[PDB]
Design a protein around this motif. Structure first.
Motif, PDB file in Angstrom:
ATOM      1  N   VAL A   1      72.161 -19.322  -9.174  1.00 45.57           N
ATOM      2  CA  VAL A   1      71.912 -17.952  -8.740  1.00 45.57           C
ATOM      3  C   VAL A   1      72.754 -16.967  -9.545  1.00 45.57           C
ATOM      4  O   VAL A   1      73.870 -17.283  -9.961  1.00 45.57           O
ATOM      5  CB  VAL A   1      72.211 -17.785  -7.233  1.00 45.57           C
ATOM      6  N   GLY A   2      72.208 -15.774  -9.762  1.00 45.46           N
ATOM      7  CA  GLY A   2      72.897 -14.739 -10.511  1.00 45.46           C
ATOM      8  C   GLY A   2      73.237 -15.198 -11.913  1.00 45.46           C
ATOM      9  O   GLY A   2      74.282 -14.840 -12.455  1.00 45.46           O
ATOM     10  N   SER A   3      72.348 -16.001 -12.491  1.00 45.96           N
ATOM     11  CA  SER A   3      72.562 -16.598 -13.808  1.00 45.96           C
ATOM     12  C   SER A   3      73.841 -17.439 -13.837  1.00 45.96           C
ATOM     13  O   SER A   3      74.386 -17.718 -14.907  1.00 45.96           O
ATOM     14  CB  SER A   3      72.616 -15.516 -14.890  1.00 45.96           C
ATOM     15  N   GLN A   4      74.305 -17.837 -12.656  1.00 49.36           N
ATOM     16  CA  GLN A   4      75.461 -18.714 -12.521  1.00 49.36           C
ATOM     17  C   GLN A   4      75.062 -19.962 -11.745  1.00 49.36           C
ATOM     18  O   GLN A   4      74.007 -19.994 -11.110  1.00 49.36           O
ATOM     19  CB  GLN A   4      76.612 -17.999 -11.814  1.00 49.36           C
TER      20      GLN A   4
END
Ligand SMILES: *[C@@H]1O[C@H](CO)[C@@H](O[C@@H]2O[C@H](CO)[C@@H](O[C@@H]3O[C@H](CO[C@H]4O[C@H](CO)[C@@H](O)[C@H](O)[C@@H]4O)[C@@H](O)[C@H](O[C@H]4O[C@H](CO)[C@@H](O)[C@H](O)[C@@H]4O)[C@@H]3O)[C@H](O)[C@H]2NC(C)=O)[C@H](O)[C@H]1NC(C)=O
Ligand SMILES: *[C@@H]1O[C@H](CO)[C@@H](O[C@@H]2O[C@H](CO)[C@@H](O)[C@H](O)[C@H]2NC(C)=O)[C@H](O)[C@H]1NC(C)=O
Ligand SMILES: *[C@@H]1O[C@H](CO)[C@@H](O)[C@H](O)[C@H]1NC(C)=O
Ligand SMILES: [Ca+2]
Ligand SMILES: [Ca+2]
Ligand SMILES: [Ca+2]
Ligand SMILES: [Ca+2]
Ligand SMILES: [Mn+2]
Ligand SMILES: [Mn+2]
Ligand SMILES: [Mn+2]
Lengths: 466, 454, 214, 4, 216
Positions: free
Chosen positions: B79-82
């Motif tokens: 999520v959130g590019s994490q």
């Protein structure tokens, strides 16, 4: 005239000697009825008492082993003598006392073992380059003080486990310095490198092949290493007849007992050896750091003189630990360990600048008192420890042993030993509370109430059962 | 004095699970007392240690207990590019447990946490986590205040300030009567140590599974510091609560930092805003002064009194020699607004390496004389070194200097009998408060029932 | 970036009906999706987060579902308040992206528009402008097309349209088409017309007037 | 800081 | 209770810069992320960027890299969105957003801030009456309001009297100036029997003209 010997109105030869050390007993038959059989030795002979029938023990103290103090601890097969006498016989009658002397010498040219225990956490990277020639230079300066020098090397970092250790990424395990632009060894708790040896170039070349590691938290697990370097006799290689110096260098604080719980470690340190053929401490990840008390025990047990050679930022810290571990010395290390050589020499001097007597297996009823003769024939009463000494110096103590009453066991033995010394004075005690005439008593004697009593020492005693 | 050392009750867990490492009394909605037990080395699904919790119903016979089930699977959320990661291997679930209301809080101080973003990472570190449960309803929730999504690079560029990556939240725990959970995090702020507080109600209502990073607005964390006195102090090694400022509406926190100020050790009393009210300093270095703390009014003046354990205190003996035996300090709260003075009493162990003061448990009024009493543990004490628990009775002037009763370990050597304690709860409902003793080394718990005074 | 295809763009439904809005992502987003509600002429209110979790204060008649790249918002038993705009938002990756949007409208019976045309006022003409207005009031559905004719020929330049949101009373729509010309260009021609094209009539509803003549 |  | 109170509507020229606000209420701004979202009728919703007010770190959609600059001052509990080198396309409504629980969600929204970029000077409306051409049972009148700026304008009939059966259409942008129209329907017996007036007010230039509808 009458004295405490006669006025007490004793009943036997045994009771007579228990009154006072000056009392004697007469076992002669031809003795007047009114004349007491328990009086001064000068009075019994005055009353025509047979000299052979007089029981009068005297407190004495004769030596059995009295080897001379050695001028040189060099060579020999541990025939070195640094305590004299080594054994004496002691005899005491009830409530009496006797005095005896002891000599102690801080022998010149005594063998020495030095185990360099080095912090190799990343903070100690600059320190490693400095000591790449220490071994040969340390040989040069100690050669003036001993011809039997052995040196060794061990290193530590911290318990190789989270959170002490970086565990991510996988690259970080093989190389804790991955995120920077260098390489360093994987984490290790403690590892033995060089067994104590007289070949000093082995020290140099072993050091030149060492490098640092890297852990997360500033306090390091040096006490784990102190423990193992102490209780692993055969691997470190401490000699029996030699001064044992354990040099501990670090620039940071140290983990202590019950710190291990932050890594999930709860098992107390067992004080046993856990360094195998791989020369690494195997219980590092499974066993908690040792307590100061446990360390003190094993240091004292193996006659190890611990030396904190730390940097200024933590001198106060280890100075305060040093007070909680008697016999421990502290020296100030530079930020790159450039002065570690002189530090050790001053520590060794400070170590052998003291003589402190210690007593083992002393019976309950026996009490002692000491007068020390330090420096220049200066008597210091009520003291048992000399200080400000140098190598080759000699001191002596006058000792008085005061017994209370008469114990059950008529023979015991205790030891007088200086702290950290091999040799010692063994005192063999003998409590002469009885009379020789008792060995030839007459049970159920015709002389004592038609056989209802016992005739010993010229008097009638009530036999067993009455 | 009036605990029964003859007819005990034994609960037992799996071999090598450290069953009894932590424990507490638990009352359901009906007021039925049970015993919650943490077993931080209990095997999980992958045949790997993850810890576990047990809820033992009261039976005079004792025996095996049913598990209080928690999620043990490693979680992952992109999520959130994490990429968020939780690792429960060797997390130590049950390394501490506490009960409040019909709710149980069991913590895994060594649950690891990492965040990935392309090639960078937040580093895999033990932020710790707490699992909460309402057994009667089956409701579950979690709390892990030290979780973050900041990358390793940022911490470096900010000189490792406010670094909660190693908090190990749940190391110690306690709950206020108002229902506010308080977690000791000895690794917080780079091993300075921090406290994390949050209402239990707000935890449950703000938790959803799979989120991993969620906000608990009503929470409250303590603060970082530039003072070297707090460095590597493990502030939060132990925690407790009480009333020390006279204000009945405010709740004060007691925190132990056994390595405070270069291993001197210390205990601090704070308001709910973590402002310091008092500080007790250790008497001796490396004694681990603050290893354990306890709060109870022992002298019957209505004012809470403070007990502090220093299990590695070395007593001074003949010939300048020391002997590690452990020690306990009693601090009686003065009348009104005044500083806690010197210790009113010093209790010292006798057995070498016995670790007297490793645990201190309020017993309530054991003998019913009107003064609350306590129990101290020397887990490796006693003549056999097997472990002992010593009872000390309250009195008008504090505590009795000598124990009224001594409980010798019924387990073999190495059981750590007394490593965990809990009292002041009547489990058999006979009108006398009882005592439970954990022995994780033996994977068992012993229950001592209080009887009428002989 | 991640695209969010939200469908349908709109739907005509009644109270009590059960409806479902969908959302398709250009790739997997593992439930990292949120649903929003913007009431007419107001701000947004959160409905769902992480795919299925209700925001606090939100009624349980709302529900989220789906997985992978296909997700849905369902409203059981529509309330009068529920008639509004709805948007989906993904936060699986940065930058966050939204859906095209979905508008819920009140359904009703079809109704033809009441057309009315108005020539330029005297005030406007004396100022040098000429605007013909054509109102198309109260109709359903909203789908409508207007066409201006000058002397019977289509005119597309200079047109200005405006629509009303669904009227609160009769649930109908309205429109206002305005053709603006110069005074000089308005007088070159005579006839002016606006044709309405609705689904209620195949034949276009025509209304017109002739300049000068009246 | 740490090990530095 | 959580509420995000943004700034009032802005009205600026192209090439200039503007700085919006979003003050926190009933909570600390520092607790969560703070996103900014742009909304247009055609283009729909667009994500500008975010900020963590605890440290000031930001993220942006590469579309807004250069124009959008997000900041925050924990002191005043406010978050800001600076826009630079403004254009006609920047004409939109802007919302500040924070999550409820999920660190990454978009749950709580401010009321929004309207932005209008135009070189248009404050112009008064030209009000024109609309009468039918030279029949049925129902009659329809109207009132055009053309060439005014800025918004809004309040329109009524007979000064609020006639309210039912009315359709006031939304304003539309006609060459930097707004245009608006309103219609009304009654019975044939009402007009021109009863006087119907178109009341238009434009508070900006402070003008309240009134035109009576006259037949042809
Ligand atoms: C290693 O071990 C040494 C020895 O214990 C420690 O040194 C002591 O540190 C403590 C705290 O830092 C000092 O305590 C303070 O003492 C002051 C009075 O001392 C005076 O007189 C002595 C006489 O010898 C002088 O040596 C000394 O310099 C002083 O002039 C008080 O003023 C202090 O009280 C204030 O603080 C305390 C809390 O600490 C409060 O309770 C008080 O109300 C007041 O506010 C304090 O009591 C002590 O003086 C130091 N002694 C020495 C000899 O230096 C090291 O700290 C320790 N280091 C490590 C790393 O472990
Ligand atoms: C220890 O030193 C003291 C000196 O203070 C010695 O004591 C005096 O010794 C004489 C013997 O010549 C006694 O007569 C005195 O009564 C002693 N005075 C005291 C004890 O105050 C003592 O003998 C020394 N001990 C040993 C074992 O040598
Ligand atoms: C006993 O003491 C006397 C005088 O104090 C001394 O001369 C003598 O040498 C002592 N005996 C021994 C064995 O040292
Ligand atoms: Ca209070
Ligand atoms: Ca009290
Ligand atoms: Ca009591
Ligand atoms: Ca009971
Ligand atoms: Mn260094
Ligand atoms: Mn370390
Ligand atoms: Mn280091």
């Amino acid at each position: 005239g009458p004295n405490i010997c006669t006025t007490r109105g004793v009943s036997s030869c045994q009771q007579c000697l228990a009154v006072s050390p000056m009392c004697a007993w007469c076992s002669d038959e031809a003795l007047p009825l009114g004349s007491p059989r328990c009086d001064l030795k000068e009075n019994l002979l005055k009353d025509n008492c047979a000299p052979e029938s007089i029981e009068f023990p005297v407190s004495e103290a004769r030596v059995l082993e009295d080897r001379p103090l050695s001028d040189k601890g060099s060579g020999d097969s541990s025939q070195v003598t640094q305590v004299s006498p080594q054994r004496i016989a002691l005899r005491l009658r009830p409530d009496d006392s006797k005095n005896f002397s002891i000599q102690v010498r801080q022998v010149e040219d005594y063998p020495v073992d030095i185990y360099y225990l080095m912090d190799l956490s990343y903070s100690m990277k600059d320190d490693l380059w400095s000591i790449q020639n220490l071994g040969t230079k340390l040989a040069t300066q100690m050669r003036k003080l001993t011809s039997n020098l052995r040196i060794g090397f061990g290193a530590f970092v911290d318990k190789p486990v989270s959170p002490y250790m970086y565990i991510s990424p996988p690259e970080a395990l093989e190389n804790p310095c991955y995120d920077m632009k260098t390489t360093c060894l994987p984490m290790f708790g403690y590892k033995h490198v060089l067994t104590l040896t007289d070949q000093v170039t082995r020290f140099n070349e072993e050091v030149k092949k060492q490098s640092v590691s890297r852990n997360r938290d500033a306090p390091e697990g040096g006490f784990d290493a102190i423990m193992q370097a102490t209780v692993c006799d055969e691997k470190i290689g401490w000699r029996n007849d030699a001064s044992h110096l354990l040099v501990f260098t670090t620039d940071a604080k140290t983990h202590i007992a019950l710190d291990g719980r932050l890594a999930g470690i709860v098992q107390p340190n067992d004080g046993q050896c856990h360094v195998g053929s791989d020369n690494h401490y195997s219980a590092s990840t499974t066993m908690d750091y040792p307590s100061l008390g446990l360390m003190t025990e094993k240091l004292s047990q193996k006659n190890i003189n611990l030396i904190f050679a730390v940097t200024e930022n933590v001198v106060n810290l280890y100075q305060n630990y040093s007070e909680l571990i008697p016999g421990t010395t502290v020296g100030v290390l530079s930020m790159d360990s450039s002065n570690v050589l002189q530090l050790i020499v001053d520590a060794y001097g400070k170590i052998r600048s003291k003589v402190e007597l210690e007593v083992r297996d002393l019976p309950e009823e026996l009490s002692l008192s000491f007068n020390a003769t330090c420096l220049n024939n200066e008597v210091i009463p009520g003291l048992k420890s000399c200080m400000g000494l140098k190598i080759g110096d000699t001191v002596s103590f006058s000792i008085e042993a005061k017994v209370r009453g008469c114990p059950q066991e008529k023979e015991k033995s205790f030891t007088i030993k200086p702290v950290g010394f091999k040799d010692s004075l063994i005192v063999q005690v003998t409590f002469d509370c009885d009379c020789a005439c008792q060995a030839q008593a007459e049970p159920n004697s015709h002389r004592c109430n038609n056989g209802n009593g016992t005739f010993e020492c010229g008097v009638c005693r009530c036999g067993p059962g009455w | 004095l009036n605990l029964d050392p003859v007819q005990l009750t034994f609960y037992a867990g799996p071999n090598g699970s450290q069953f009894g490492f932590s424990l507490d009394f638990h009352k359901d909605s009906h007021g039925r007392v049970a015993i919650v037990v943490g077993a931080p080395r209990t095997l999980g699904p992958s045949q790997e240690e993850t810890g576990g919790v047990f809820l033992c119903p009261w039976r005079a016979e004792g025996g095996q207990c049913p598990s209080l089930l928690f999620d043990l699977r490693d979680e992952t959320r992109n999520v959130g590019s994490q990429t968020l990661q939780t690792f429960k291997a060797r997390q130590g679930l049950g390394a501490s447990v506490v009960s409040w209301s019909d709710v149980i809080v069991a913590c895994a101080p060594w649950q690891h946490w990492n965040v990935l973003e392309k090639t960078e990472e937040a580093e895999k570190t033990p932020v710790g986590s707490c699992f909460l449960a309402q057994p009667e309803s089956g409701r579950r929730a979690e709390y892990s205040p030290c979780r973050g999504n900041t990358l390793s690079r940022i911490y470096v560029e900010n000189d490792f300030s406010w670094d909660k990556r190693y908090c190990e939240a749940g190391f110690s725990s306690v709950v206020t009567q108002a229902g506010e959970l308080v977690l000791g995090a000895p690794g917080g702020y780079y091993f300075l140590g921090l406290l994390a507080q949050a209402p239990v109600a707000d935890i449950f209502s703000s938790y959803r599974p799979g989120i991993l990073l969620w906000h608990v607005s009503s929470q409250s964390l303590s603060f970082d510091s530039s003072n070297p006195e707090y460095f590597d102090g493990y502030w939060g090694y132990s925690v407790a609560v009480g009333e020390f400022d006279g204000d009945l509406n405010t709740t004060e926190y007691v925190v132990g930092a056994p390595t405070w100020s270069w291993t001197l050790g210390a205990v601090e009393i704070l308001d709910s805003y973590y402002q310091r009210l008092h500080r007790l300093r250790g008497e001796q270095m490396a004694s681990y002064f603050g290893h354990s703390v306890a709060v109870t009014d022992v002298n019957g003046d209505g004012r809470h009194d403070l007990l502090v354990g220093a299990p590695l205190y070395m007593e001074s003996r003949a010939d300048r020699k020391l002997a590690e035996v452990g020690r306990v300090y009693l601090f009686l709260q003065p009348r009104g607004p005044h500083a806690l003075g010197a210790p009113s009493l010093l209790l010292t162990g006798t057995q070498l390496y016995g670790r007297f003061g490793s645990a201190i448990a309020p017993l309530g009024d054991l003998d019913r004389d009107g003064y609350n009493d306590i129990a101290v543990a020397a887990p490796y004490g006693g003549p056999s070194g097997r472990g002992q628990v010593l009872v000390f009775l309250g009195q008008s002037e504090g505590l009795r200097s000598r124990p009224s009763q001594v409980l010798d370990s019924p387990f073999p050597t190495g059981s750590a009998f007394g490593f965990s304690l809990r009292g002041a709860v009547d489990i058999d409902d006979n009108g006398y408060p009882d005592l439970i003793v954990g022995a994780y080394g033996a994977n068992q718990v012993a229950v001592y029932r209080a009887q009428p005074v002989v | 970036d991640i695209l969010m295809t939200q469908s349908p763009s709109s739907m005509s439904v009644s109270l009590g009906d059960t409806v479902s809005i969908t959302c398709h992502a250009s790739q997997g987003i593992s439930s990292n999706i949120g649903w929003l509600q913007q009431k007419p002429g107001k701000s947004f209110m959160g409905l769902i987060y992480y795919g299925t979790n209700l925001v606090d204060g939100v009624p349980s008649r709302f529900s989220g579902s789906g997985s992978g790249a296909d997700y849905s918002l369902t409203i059981s038993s529509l309330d009068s308040e529920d008639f509004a705009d709805y948007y989906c938002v993904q936060y699986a990756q940065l930058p966050y992206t939204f859906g095209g949007g979905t508008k819920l409208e009140i359904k009703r019976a079809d109704a033809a528009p009441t057309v009315s045309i108005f020539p330029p006022s005297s005030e406007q003409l004396t100022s040098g402008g000429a605007s013909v207005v054509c109102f198309l009031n109260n109709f359903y559905p909203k789908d409508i097309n207007v066409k201006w004719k000058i002397d019977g020929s289509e005119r597309q330049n200079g047109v200005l349209n405006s629509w009303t949101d669904q009227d609160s009373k009769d649930s109908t729509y309205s429109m206002s088409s305005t053709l603006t010309l110069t005074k000089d260009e308005y007088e070159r021609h005579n006839s002016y017309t606006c044709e309405a094209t609705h689904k209620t009539s195949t034949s276009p509803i025509v209304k017109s007037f002739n300049r000068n003549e009246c | 800081a740490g090990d530095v | 209770e959580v509420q995000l109170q943004q700034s009032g509507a802005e009205l600026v020229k192209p090439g200039a810069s503007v700085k919006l606000s979003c003050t926190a209420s009933g909570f600390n701004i520092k607790d969560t992320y703070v996103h900014w979202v742009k909304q247009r009728p055609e283009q729909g919703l667009e994500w500008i960027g975010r900020i963590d007010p605890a440290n000031g770190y930001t993220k942006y959609d590469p579309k807004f890299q250069g124009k959008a600059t997000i900041t925050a001052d924990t002191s005043s509990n406010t978050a800001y969105l600076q826009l630079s080198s403004l254009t006609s396309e920047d004409t939109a409504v802007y919302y500040c957003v924070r999550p409820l629980y999920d660190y990454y969600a978009m749950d709580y929204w401010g009321q929004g801030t309207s932005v209008t970029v135009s070189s248009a000077k404050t112009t008064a409306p030209s009000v024109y009456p609309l009468a039918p051409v030279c029949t049925g049972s129902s009659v329809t009148l109207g009132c055009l309001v053309k060439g005014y700026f800025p918004e809004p304008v309040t329109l009524t009939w007979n000064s609020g009297s006639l309210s039912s059966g009315v359709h006031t259409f939304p304003a539309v942008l006609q060459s930097d100036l707004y245009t608006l129209s309103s219609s009304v329907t009654v019975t044939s017996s009402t007009w021109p029997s009863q006087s119907i007036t178109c009341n238009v007010a434009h508070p900006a230039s402070s003008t309240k003209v009134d035109k009576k509808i006259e037949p042809r």
